[PDB]
Nucleic acid binder design. Structure first.
Ligand SMILES: [Mg+2]
Ligand code: NA
Length: 1217
RNA sequence: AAUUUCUACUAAGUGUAGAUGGAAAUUAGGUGCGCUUGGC
DNA sequence: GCCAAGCGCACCTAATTTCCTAGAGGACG
DNA sequence: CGTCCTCTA
């Protein structure tokens, strides 16, 4: 047997199957005539309106409770939370207080007399109408009288808000786990950074943010946290931290802005405050003012013309500022000024090419007077900060004879105005009144471009003009220039609101209608499938050969299908007969202790007292003999209950064997499910569809086409297995199915069409049939061009698991006794999205390859898809759409499509090699920092892999085989959340990443040297700590013999004594100032360096000779070369041809490991590149953990640490060879 | 260039291969642009 | 040119909760 | 009392 074989039927999970519902016969005509779809579409709109009106009540209920609550456990909790030496029993007391703090909040809600009525019909029928004051709102609510069952789920979503448990949707969790934690962390930050703020800044926040009713420091003491339970107080507190924007546009500074300013001034790095999260269900209104935007295309065009045409206001000032700057030479150069900040940087780049030239030229003139060098540049930075403004006459001093600044300014303002004119010539037709759009502005890229190119050039002109304001408050100021300048600039500034508002409109996703749910006038439509509820739900399933049907009875003919006989003679549909006894532990007492039943039988006071007391449950009041008789009472009653005794041919165990009541309940639950089919006359049923008393839909996907011939979708297999005699409860059909209408979203005639009898190009370059010619047209996106019904069907897998064990423990036992267990190591990155290495139980590489491309073979045809290229494309189309105001397209479907190929290949590897999976213990935190590279796939890869391994099916297998659809493998624990995962998830192990890639696989050598240059004396010490440094004539290499015991914090190394060589090349990454690269030849570079300084490098050991240098540049250049030598991973940014791994150390045969010597080979014994090396050593770090399982008794496997330490790893990697 | 839906296809002619947990609710994040005040 | 703190708008992405029910019971003509 | 919607565990 294998290890996989042990992991079937371990736990339950639910899934949904989705199908198209094709109306059959006169079904559609009858639905058209009764106007059912228009009623359902209006209902969904009204339903969202009532949901919004309920939230208005719910929120008022919440705030009245939260505004009045004083947390009792609070000060004890904060005190203990801030303790830094906590005993393990103090940590336990902290959890107890956290829990009790959430119980205070939950009981405050749930202790209200009205709480229960908030989630029954009372809230719609009575409570909400009395709360409301608007005749039309009240009438919207009243329209759901008799339909409140439709809110049962929404009432569960609202009930979740009032839980006491540490659950993400709970109010208490938001208050105590999240916001109280940030409030307390912020208190500590306040006590550190307190003194940075001066009286004026703290008084400003008090006045403009705190309504002069509080001091800023109040919100950093524990007793004020109650103020911050409601959104109103969260806004105030977050304004303290972040400030707000006034009606005038002024940005008032919060504490975090002041902290930043101080940090940027003192070059320090003080910590910043965290803002609190929003209160659940609050309707947020910002404390900052933001002007009113636009609401219609017509309005965007009227504003664009009124404000930007030729004879418009904003234009005429561009015309003014132009002629103004074209006459600079009537105003004193001494009185016009460029304020010392971004203005002087801007002007520097536009006059001297680079932002820093003006400061540089000023620094040189400072040096000329004032000539300790870190003192200096600090004073000289200060002395230069004290200058507020530079006049144009002063800036002329910096020009070089060929250059005059004023004339250079002129051509700049000419350059930009010519750019403005140019764009108007492309905006001729837009400014005409006779023009009106052929397309809407959220879907008319050509018109948006003409506007955006216009708006851009005006902003470009405006930012250049803004540099000429100066500080303003300078005396010498030429008010014959500023007078007209200030007037034409303050009008141009009006473009800021227009630019902002036009982008805010024009980049809006256009409206797309959602599908909507169908009820067929029944508030509990299709609620379940039980035969005894057909009349209440009015939906059933029929089968005619291989085709399946949904059958719906009209509200006025609920019985119309039960009475149908069989047509012994002609044809018959098969009508489903489904029986379910759900949740026997609750159902059985509710039915047999009911008035409708306690009339029939009478439970003895013996039977009555025991359920009244609670002596049935395992707990603090147990008694096995009571549940024994209780079980026999239930068993006795099941016989007398007709609609159960005949539905499930029960086969209970001998009563004396149950240990608690849940032992009886599990047999009732498992046996309380039966699905069969009864016959029904096809002619009689079809007539019902004709007459309109029955609606019929084929449950359809393409696997049910008459033309289908390939392997079905896995979901088709699940669906058909629902009704297969070999399915003995492994997959159950559940209630809760739903039916929707998705209106067409594309016009048929607007679709891309490959017309019949014209050859279509095949796109797969490995496909030798280059063309396909069909006798019928084929349309792009055909399915969205017709209205479609869709049916969603929930199923339950392994509802009654028999293999209950701790899955993690079982894997460890199995690995312990496996004499040769395989490992799939998976390195996750961005140069290679995913890299796979499979090892055997001795660490021999069995398979290795990147998954940037997916290789598939079918029908002899090979196909290769470069998903790394596709995602890179999509990522760049999205980056451009954002900057151009064009459509931002989805990437997550492409990711999902890519990841599904990956997951499929990993499942084949798992099955082929019976292998566990090794991954890097990537903390949540590294993963969010790489989310900016939208190609990123780390977490989506994890979610889909874990999901598939919750129920893993080779869909080619026999369905009754282990690993077929009825006996799926369950080798990860049931996905509840990431939050709750450990470093083992069944067959998946997460191990420490440290030096899995930057390590020589052939020796175990790693770079543990600190080679950043710091000073001459440190460089001399570093050099002298080598045992020898010499040139080796016979190899043309420099040798650097070292004992790691002579260097700082090298303890993890095992071998200690290494000989490094200047062997081969490296790629030096650096910025000139963005990331560039150059190849370096090490030996040749060392010779260049030593020659530059007259160093006779042939002179045997040269450690002492190198320490005779006095130039800092020598030691600095020498340390850089050492870093390059110790840099084993080398790559070009965005390049497939360079990502090699090269070792500066020889192995036992005198060979340097060079991954490129393995890149060539098709079957390689060592990794083929650095990413393969990463995956290899990730797998080996799990081999190590397996080695720990084997050193341990079985009873203790659960407590074996799987995280190899850094010291253990180097030892392991340096003794494996 | 067809789909319950998605990705890649045309796969032998209305389709092929793999994947696919829906619904509702809550909440958070990332990118991009503008504005405020600042730092190389 | 790059970057920080903060406010705003637009977009897409995604984490974590809950249900996946038949039969008693009530309202009502 | 028959039917339809609500509620419960
Ligand atoms: Mg198929
Ligand atoms: Na942002």
């Amino acid at each position: 047997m294998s290890k996989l074989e042990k992991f079937t039927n371990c736990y339950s999970l639910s899934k949904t199957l989705r199908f198209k519902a094709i109306p059959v016969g006169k079904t559609q005509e009858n639905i058209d005539n009764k106007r059912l779809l228009v009623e359902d579409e209006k209902r969904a709109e009204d339903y969202k309106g009532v949901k919004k009106l309920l939230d208005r009540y719910y929120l008022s209920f919440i705030n009245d409770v939260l505004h009045s609550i004083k947390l009792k456990n609070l000060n004890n909790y904060i005190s203990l939370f801030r303790k830094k030496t906590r005993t393990e029993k103090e940590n336990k007391e902290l959890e107890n207080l956290e829990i009790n703090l959430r119980k205070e909040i939950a009981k405050a809600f749930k202790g209200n007399e009205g709480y229960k009525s908030l989630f029954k019909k009372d809230i719609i029928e009575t409570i909400l109408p009395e709360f409301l004051d608007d005749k039309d709102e009240i009438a919207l609510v009243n329209s759901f009288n008799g339909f409140t069952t439709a809110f049962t789920g929404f009432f569960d979503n609202r009930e979740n808000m009032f839980s006491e448990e540490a659950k993400s949707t709970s109010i208490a969790f938001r208050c105590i786990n999240e916001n109280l934690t940030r409030y307390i962390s912020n208190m500590d930050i306040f006590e550190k950074v307190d003194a940075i703020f001066d009286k004026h800044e703290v008084q400003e926040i008090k006045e403009k943010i705190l309504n002069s009713d509080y001091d800023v420091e109040d919100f950093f003491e524990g007793e004020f946290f109650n103020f911050v339970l409601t959104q109103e107080g969260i806004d105030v507190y977050n304004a303290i931290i972040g400030g707000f924007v006034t009606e005038s546009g002024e940005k008032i500074k919060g504490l975090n802005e002041y902290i930043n300013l101080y940090n940027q001034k003192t070059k320090q790095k003080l910590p910043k405050f965290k803002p609190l999260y929003k209160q659940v269900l609050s309707d947020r209104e910002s404390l900052s003012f933001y002007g009113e935007g636009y609401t219609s295309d017509e309005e965007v065009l009227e504003v664009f013309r009124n404000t930007l045409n030729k004879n418009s206001e904003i234009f005429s000032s561009i015309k003014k500022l132009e002629k103004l700057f074209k006459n600079f030479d009537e105003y004193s150069s001494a009185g016009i000024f460029v304020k010392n900040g971004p203005a002087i940087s801007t002007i520097s780049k536009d006059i001297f090419g680079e932002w820093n030239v003006i400061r540089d030229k000023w620094n040189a003139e400072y040096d000329d007077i004032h000539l300790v060098t870190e003192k200096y540049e600090d004073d000289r930075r200060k002395s230069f900060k004290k200058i507020g403004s530079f006049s144009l006459e002063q800036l002329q001093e910096y020009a070089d004879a060929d250059l005059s600044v004023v004339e250079k300014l002129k051509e700049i303002i000419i350059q930009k105005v010519d750019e403005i004119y140019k764009v108007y010539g492309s905006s001729e037709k837009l400014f005409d009144a006779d023009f009106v759009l052929e397309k809407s502005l959220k879907k008319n890229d050509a018109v948006v471009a003409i506007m955006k190119d216009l708006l851009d050039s005006v902003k470009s002109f405006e930012n250049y003009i803004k540099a000429f304001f100066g500080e303003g408050k300078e005396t010498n100021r030429d008010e014959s220039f500023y007078g007209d300048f200030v007037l034409a600039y303050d009008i141009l500034l009006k473009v800021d609101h227009i630019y902002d508002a036009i982008r805010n409109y024009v980049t809006q996703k256009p409206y797309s209608k959602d599908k909507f749910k169908l009820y067929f006038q029944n508030p509990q439509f299709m609620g379940g499938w039980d035969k005894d509820k057909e009349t209440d739900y009015r939906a059933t399933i029929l089968r005619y050969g291989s085709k399946y049907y949904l059958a719906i009875m009209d509200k006025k003919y609920a019985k119309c299908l039960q009475k149908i006989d069989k047509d012994d003679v002609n044809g018959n549909y098969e009508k489903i007969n489904y029986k379910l006894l759900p949740g026997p532990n609750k159902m059985l007492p509710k039915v047999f202790f009911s008035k409708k039943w306690m009339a029939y039988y009478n439970p003895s006071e013996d039977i009555q007292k025991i359920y009244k007391n609670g002596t049935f449950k395992k707990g603090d009041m147990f008694n096995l003999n009571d549940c024994h008789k209780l079980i026999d009472f239930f068993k006795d009653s099941i016989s007398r209950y007709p609609k159960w005794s005949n539905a499930y041919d029960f086969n209970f165990s001998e009563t004396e064997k149950y240990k608690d009541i849940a032992g009886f309940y599990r047999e009732v639950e498992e046996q309380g499910y039966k699905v069969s089919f009864e016959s029904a006359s096809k002619k009689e049923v079809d007539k019902l569809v004709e007459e309109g008393k029955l609606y019929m839909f084929q449950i359809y996907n393409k696997d049910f086409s008459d033309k289908s011939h390939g392997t079905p979708n896995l979901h088709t297999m699940y669906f058909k297995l629902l009704f297969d005699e070999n399915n003995h409860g492994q997959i159950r059909l559940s209630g809760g199915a739903e039916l929707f209408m998705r209106r067409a979203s594309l016009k048929k005639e607007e679709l891309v069409v490959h017309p019949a009898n014209s050859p279509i190009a095949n796109k797969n370059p490995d496909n030798p049939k280059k063309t396909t010619t069909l006798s019928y047209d084929v349309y792009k996106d055909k399915r969205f061009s017709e209205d479609q019904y869709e049916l969603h069907i929930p199923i339950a897998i392994n509802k009654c698991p028999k293999n209950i064990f701790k899955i993690n423990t079982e894997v460890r036992v199995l690995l312990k006794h496996d004499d040769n267990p395989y490992v799939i190591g998976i390195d996750r990155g961005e140069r290679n999205l995913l890299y796979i290495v499979v090892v055997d139980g001795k660490g021999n590489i069995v398979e290795q390859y990147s998954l940037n491309e997916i290789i598939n073979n079918f029908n002899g045809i090979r196909i290769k898809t470069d998903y790394h290229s596709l995602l890179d494309k999509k990522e760049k189309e999205r980056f451009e759409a954002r900057q151009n105001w064009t459509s931002i397209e989805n990437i997550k479907e492409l990711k999902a499509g890519y990841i599904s190929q990956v997951v499929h290949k990993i499942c084949e590897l798992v099955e082929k090699y019976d292998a566990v999976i090794a991954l890097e213990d990537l903390n949540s935190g590294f993963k969010n920092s790489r989310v900016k590279v939208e190609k990123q796939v780390y977490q989506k890869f994890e979610k889909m892999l874990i999901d598939k391994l919750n129920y893993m099916v080779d869909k080619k297998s026999n369905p009754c085989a282990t690993g077929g659809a009825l006996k799926g493998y369950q080798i990860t624990n049931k996905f509840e959340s990431f939050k709750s995962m450990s470093t083992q998830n069944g067959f998946i192990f997460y191990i420490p990443a440290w030096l899995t890639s930057k390590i020589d696989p052939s020796t175990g050598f790693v770079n543990l040297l600190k080679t950043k240059y710091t000073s001459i004396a440190d460089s001399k010490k570093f050099i002298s700590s080598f045992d020898r440094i010499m040139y080796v004539p016979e190899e043309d290499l420099f040798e650097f013999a070292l004992d790691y015991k002579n260097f700082s914090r090298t303890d993890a190394d095992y071998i200690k004594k290494w000989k490094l060589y200047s062997y081969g090349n490296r790629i030096r990454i650096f910025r000139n100032n963005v990331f560039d690269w150059e190849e370096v030849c090490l030996t040749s570079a060392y010779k260049e360096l030593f020659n530059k300084y007259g160093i006779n490098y042939q002179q045997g050991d040269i450690r002492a000779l190198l320490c005779e240098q006095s130039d800092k540049a020598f030691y600095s250049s020498f340390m850089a070369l050492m870093s390059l030598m110790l840099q084993m991973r080398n790559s070009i940014t965005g390049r497939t041809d360079v990502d090699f791994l090269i070792s500066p150390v020889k192995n036992s045969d005198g060979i340097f490991y060079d991954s490129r010597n393995y890149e060539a080979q098709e079957n390689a014994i060592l990794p083929k590149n650095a990413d393969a090396n990463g995956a290899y050593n990730i797998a080996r770090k799990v081999l190590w953990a397996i080695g720990q399982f084997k050193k341990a008794e079985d009873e203790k496997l659960d407590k074996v640490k799987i995280a190899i330490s850094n010291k253990e790893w180097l030892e392991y990697a340096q003794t494996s060879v």
